[PDB]
């Protein structure tokens, strides 16, 4: 829950929005995101994501 950083490129993930365009429905917790999922426009993979305190 809450938003999250990428790691370096600068693509903050928002769970309330999800990333449905990429395959992650809205309301998907960053933890629940499949490890097969990757940054929308960056090539690294979900790792070392800091929580964004909205
Ligand atoms: Fe990225």
- Provide the CATH number for the domain around residue 34: 2.20.28.10
Tell me how far the alpha carbon of residue 6 lies from the centroid of ligand 1, in angstroms: 5
Q: Where is 40: in which H helix or E strand?
A: none
Is 39 part of any known ligand binding site? yes
What is the C-alpha separation between 46 and 54, in angstroms, rounded? 20
Tell me how far the alpha carbon of residue 43 lies from the centroid of ligand 1, in angstroms: 6
Tell me how far the alpha carbon of residue 12 lies from the centroid of ligand 1, in angstroms: 8
What is the C-alpha separation between 31 and 44, in angstroms, rounded? 16
Q: Domain containing 34: what range?
A: 1-54
Method of elucidation: NMR
Q: Cα separations (Å) of 23 from 4, 26, 40, 54?
A: 17, 10, 9, 24
**Domain tally for the chain?**
1
What is the C-alpha separation between 23 and 30, in angstroms, rounded? 13
What is the C-alpha separation between 39 and 48, in angstroms, rounded? 12
Is 40 part of any known ligand binding site? no
Alpha helices (H) in the chain, listed in sequence order: none
């Amino acid at each position: 829950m809450k938003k999250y950083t990428c790691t370096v490129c600068g693509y903050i993930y928002n769970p309330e929005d999800g990333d449905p365009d990429n395959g992650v429905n809205p309301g998907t917790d960053f933890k629940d995101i499949p490890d097969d999922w990757v940054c929308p426009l960056c090539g690294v993979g979900k790792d070392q994501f800091e929580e964004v305190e909205e």
